[PDB]
């Protein structure tokens, strides 16, 4: 599945920590569940 952030907006996700490259692109909390 995506990662937290890639849930709430949808844009896939590869799974890798801490924090997904689109999280670290657009800096924002990367949180897994
Ligand atoms: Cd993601
Ligand atoms: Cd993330």
């Given at each position: 599945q995506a990662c937290d952030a890639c849930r709430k907006?949808?844009?896939?996700?590869?799974?890798?920590?801490?924090?997904?490259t689109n999280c670290l692109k657009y800096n924002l909390d990367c949180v897994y569940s």
């Open positions: 907006k949808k844009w896939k996700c590869s799974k890798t920590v801490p924090t997904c």
